[PDB]
Amino acid sequence: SQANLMRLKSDLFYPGPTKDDPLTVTLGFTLQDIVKADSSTNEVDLVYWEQQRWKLNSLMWDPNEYGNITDFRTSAADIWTPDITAYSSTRPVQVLSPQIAVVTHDGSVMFIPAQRLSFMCDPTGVDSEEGATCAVKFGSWVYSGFEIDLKTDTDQVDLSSYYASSKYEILSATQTRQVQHYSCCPEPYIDVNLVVKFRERRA
Amino acid sequence: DKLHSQANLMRLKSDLFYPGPTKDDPLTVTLGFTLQDIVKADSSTNEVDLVYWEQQRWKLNSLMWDPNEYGNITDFRTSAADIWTPDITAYSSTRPVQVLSPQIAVVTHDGSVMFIPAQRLSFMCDPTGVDSEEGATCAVKFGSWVYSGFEIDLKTDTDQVDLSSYYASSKYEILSATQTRQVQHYSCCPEPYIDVNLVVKFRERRA
Amino acid sequence: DKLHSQANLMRLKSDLFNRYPGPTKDDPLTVTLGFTLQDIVKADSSTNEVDLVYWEQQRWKLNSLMWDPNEYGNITDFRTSAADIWTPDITAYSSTRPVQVLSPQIAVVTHDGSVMFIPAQRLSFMCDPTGVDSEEGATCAVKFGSWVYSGFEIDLKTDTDQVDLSSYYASSKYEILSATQTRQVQHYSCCPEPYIDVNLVVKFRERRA
Amino acid sequence: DKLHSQANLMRLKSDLFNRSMYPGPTKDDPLTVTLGFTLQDIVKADSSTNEVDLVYWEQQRWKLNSLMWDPNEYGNITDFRTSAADIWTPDITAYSSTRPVQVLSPQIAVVTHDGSVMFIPAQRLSFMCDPTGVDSEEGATCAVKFGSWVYSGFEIDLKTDTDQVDLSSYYASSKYEILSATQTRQVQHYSCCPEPYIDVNLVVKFRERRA
Amino acid sequence: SQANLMRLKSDLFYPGPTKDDPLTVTLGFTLQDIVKADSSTNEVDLVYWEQQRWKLNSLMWDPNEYGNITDFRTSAADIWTPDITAYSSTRPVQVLSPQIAVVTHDGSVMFIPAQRLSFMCDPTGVDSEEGATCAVKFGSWVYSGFEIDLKTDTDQVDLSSYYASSKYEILSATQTRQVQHYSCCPEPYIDVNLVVKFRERRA
Ligand SMILES: c1cncc([C@H]2CC3CCN2CC3)c1
Numbered sequence A, E: 001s002q003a004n005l006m007r008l009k010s011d012l013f014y015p016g017p018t019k020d021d022p023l024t025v026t027l028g029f030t031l032q033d034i035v036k037a038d039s040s041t042n043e044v045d046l047v048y049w050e051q052q053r054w055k056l057n058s059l060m061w062d063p064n065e066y067g068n069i070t071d072f073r074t075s076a077a078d079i080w081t082p083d084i085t086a087y088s089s090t091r092p093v094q095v096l097s098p099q100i101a102v103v104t105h106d107g108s109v110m111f112i113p114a115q116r117l118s119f120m121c122d123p124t125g126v127d128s129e130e131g132a133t134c135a136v137k138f139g140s141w142v143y144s145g146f147e148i149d150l151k152t153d154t155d156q157v158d159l160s161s162y163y164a165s166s167k168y169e170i171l172s173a174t175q176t177r178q179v180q181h182y183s184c185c186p187e188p189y190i191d192v193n194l195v196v197k198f199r200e201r202r203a
Numbered sequence B: 001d002k003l004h005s006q007a008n009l010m011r012l013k014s015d016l017f018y019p020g021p022t023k024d025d026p027l028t029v030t031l032g033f034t035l036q037d038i039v040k041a042d043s044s045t046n047e048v049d050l051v052y053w054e055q056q057r058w059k060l061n062s063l064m065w066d067p068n069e070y071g072n073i074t075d076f077r078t079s080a081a082d083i084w085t086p087d088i089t090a091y092s093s094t095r096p097v098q099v100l101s102p103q104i105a106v107v108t109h110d111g112s113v114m115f116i117p118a119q120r121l122s123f124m125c126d127p128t129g130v131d132s133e134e135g136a137t138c139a140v141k142f143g144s145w146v147y148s149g150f151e152i153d154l155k156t157d158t159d160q161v162d163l164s165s166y167y168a169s170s171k172y173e174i175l176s177a178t179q180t181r182q183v184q185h186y187s188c189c190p191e192p193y194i195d196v197n198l199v200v201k202f203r204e205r206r207a
Numbered sequence C: 001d002k003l004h005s006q007a008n009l010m011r012l013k014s015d016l017f018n019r020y021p022g023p024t025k026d027d028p029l030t031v032t033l034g035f036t037l038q039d040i041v042k043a044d045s046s047t048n049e050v051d052l053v054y055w056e057q058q059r060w061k062l063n064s065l066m067w068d069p070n071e072y073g074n075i076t077d078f079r080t081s082a083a084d085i086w087t088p089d090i091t092a093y094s095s096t097r098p099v100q101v102l103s104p105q106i107a108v109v110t111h112d113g114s115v116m117f118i119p120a121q122r123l124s125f126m127c128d129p130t131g132v133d134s135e136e137g138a139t140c141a142v143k144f145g146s147w148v149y150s151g152f153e154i155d156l157k158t159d160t161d162q163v164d165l166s167s168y169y170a171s172s173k174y175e176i177l178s179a180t181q182t183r184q185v186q187h188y189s190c191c192p193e194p195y196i197d198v199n200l201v202v203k204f205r206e207r208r209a
Numbered sequence D: 001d002k003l004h005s006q007a008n009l010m011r012l013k014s015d016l017f018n019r020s021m022y023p024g025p026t027k028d029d030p031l032t033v034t035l036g037f038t039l040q041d042i043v044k045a046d047s048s049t050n051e052v053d054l055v056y057w058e059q060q061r062w063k064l065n066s067l068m069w070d071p072n073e074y075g076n077i078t079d080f081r082t083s084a085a086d087i088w089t090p091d092i093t094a095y096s097s098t099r100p101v102q103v104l105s106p107q108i109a110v111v112t113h114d115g116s117v118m119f120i121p122a123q124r125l126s127f128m129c130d131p132t133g134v135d136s137e138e139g140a141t142c143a144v145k146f147g148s149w150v151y152s153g154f155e156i157d158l159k160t161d162t163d164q165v166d167l168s169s170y171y172a173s174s175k176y177e178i179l180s181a182t183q184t185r186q187v188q189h190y191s192c193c194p195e196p197y198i199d200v201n202l203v204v205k206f207r208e209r210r211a
């Protein structure tokens, strides 16, 4: 089986998406913890898992040709991955988990990096019943909507793994598709907007 | 003589130098923690910083060799990047874990591998009660990030965290530290999932 | 047909890369610079340093990067790692920490041989924020230019003297009273040759909550 | 002539590297590393976390047969400098650091024709240390062991030249003054392994310096 | 034009200095800013440009054979560079500028990296009229005086680019060559000693 896997990988190992060969990446966010809210600089720090999924013809294989192998794990540097970027980060994003993706015989890839992000956020009112609200856009930095498209499986941020003893509780968190125009180029870019309303948790 | 033993080790490393575990070729990884120090308990962000040695042990057929065919060499040291290693991860870290020791593993002729990285970890933890008699209790799960229980099974030698190297003058004293294997099931998948749950009860040490 | 389009791109990239030593006095380069100011994160009066987040739009044109779209299936542009190509050494002349890169280091190349590179960056630079809590506010400046190329190898241009503020963080601790980007020419002790820079002048003030 | 010497060094380096290989020490071919510390500064002592930060130079010395050469055979070159990445280096590690060590100096070693290597990285280290009593006459006492992380005493042995830490470069205007600093060899056993491991124990007694 | 430069660089692209082939490095400091003076740890943070110059025969060429090229720019990683090091830094020095050098046809190299350095320094008196005085030595870490010699053009630090609105004003800054011995080796080591007297600037 080891030989089969090796052979498959060898046989497998695409210049990224193009206007003729567009790509749809599905984004989903799991919010694990709001670590810190700095009212002196208006930066908030999030820990979250960013689920990325996409599908490439060039990654399909017949499991029957490879000992019934239906999927495998490989370093994310072994394959192409989307340049999904936070548009209002204030520090470089920190990766908390192993950079390893899962590839299925149907040519779909799933890559779920855990990250810590500092982004621009005014925490004013976090100490009130209404809480504070902040938002950060996630999308390709260099690919327009014509090259890379984004969609979500749902507009509800997954909160099932949120840290129950965090300094902050989540009142709501959504994730929404957006189309933006920027001064630099004619073509529009796509992002998923993460909107979180949150409040200091009482002990 | 000494030149002959070097040649022997070189030939052995050449011959040995695996796509990782699979459902058909599963792997048991043994984890063990040696808790060295609780450096810091931040009640303003609810992060606690631990220093520990994380002992990982696994066994591969593809790393076996007959010692008599290589000058009685029973084991050797090699860079951790020369071999496959488990993607064991803390599930609730708040910053990238920091490695404090050389990334080198010990390989034994039976194919068993021992890898003990030293690490500093910030993880999610409410230190409420740390200043009390009963202390604070926090927990952090360690497991594979991308492998299920059908590819990587985890085991412990014991459920007692090794405290023989715990820093005696730490700001915090350990009341109890346990390491327990956990098997869980999720709706999304049929495969069982495994992790080792590190639970530490600690309080402020009196000077 | 899609496998053909991928092959075409691979062919184009292949031809261009496996075929530029940077600008010279004989073959000088004009780099256009534009700044998009996104946030003034912090102003530290203890050390006289200010931290900004901005997008640094860079454009230049290389004959060596030209291709005929018809010969390549109508590809008019492509994305490529900034490491696969030459990029200008545009540098802040008064930073106090290494610039932090916040965006993927990828450039866009068009068939006419022009490149567009827009790194998002956080920059700490020298700045006395005195008066930032006053009506007139505080003024600060930071020069941007090549570190090693003189005005003879690299010339700088702007498309406008007005910094793009259309993306400035509305709820920042600081608000922008004005922000300009202006071409300048300076001389240094080490070298006779002039160096060219774009001066970023920002007048800012504490935003009333 | 000068070109001749350059060529000679190149030839030598090439003979030693590209065409020689040393897999590290073993039970049959064990290595002895001489360790010495030049303590330069106690930068900070944090009583809230019990961490102390040291700046020091760590003099490492070992000798390999496979690095020996005949100077007469290479234009009388008796030594040379090379990137520490071109040769094997001991995995000498502090056993109680709380953060990754920070390297302050270029990672370049000196190789001598007898096969001896000298490597002296300057480092800043945060390690576990209770600084209670640092404001007393007696001062505070802390210790930290340095040893190979993965080699037992059967593969790597350690020794010092002297038990006296080199204090001739200690920063005279540091916040903290040194009352004594010793470096001592130790043999220890750890639960994971049967084999004993070797360390040099750096023990420092220090005190707040009066202005 | 581009072809000539490419040919030249290819033709050019030395194991470092030796006793039989020593090297003289000229050092010059341009002090731009004293960012911070920390009296709790006795560390001071400097921002400066460190001009390095040296000459290699093996980098010489005839401009006549190369389209009249008299100089070119190249990555500092393409050539040997001197391991000039602050002897009393307390943090890894941080490089603020692109690692690129200028090579001239006579074989002379000029390399001017901007750096931020924390180094050992008691800032006591910095709030007085006479100010505070600190020093830090710069030299090769591993080449003795028999392999690398150092020198300044002048003993006066270039203050022409010093930040006018720094928290600290410069009363004087000098750069002087020194010969020193260390316990580790019999051979002498060469350094250039940066001595700065400074005080808090009145607003
Ligand atoms: C093109 C190339 N590099 C960067 C971009 C930037 C510009 C701007 C920010 C996000 N993205 C599109 C909008 C476009």
Ligand SMILES: c1cncc([C@H]2CC3CCN2CC3)c1
Pocket: C146, C147, C148, C188, C190, C191, C195, E049, E100, E102, E110, E111, E112, E113
């Ligand atoms: C030459 C080489 N390397 C760096 C430089 C620096 C020094 C000086 C200021 C900015 N820049 C141009 C002149 C020049």
Ligand SMILES: c1cncc([C@H]2CC3CCN2CC3)c1
Pocket: B053, B104, B105, B106, B114, B115, B116, D148, D149, D150, D190, D192, D193, D197
């Ligand atoms: C064996 C392999 N890798 C690491 C070790 C560790 C365990 C323990 C701490 C330092 N070191 C030797 C003793 C042993």
Ligand SMILES: c1cncc([C@H]2CC3CCN2CC3)c1
Pocket: D108, D109, D110, D118, D119, D120, E140, E141, E142, E182, E184, E185, E189
């Ligand atoms: C020899 C080899 N490697 C480092 C050194 C150190 C020792 C000491 C400090 C700076 N440098 C020369 C003198 C010498």
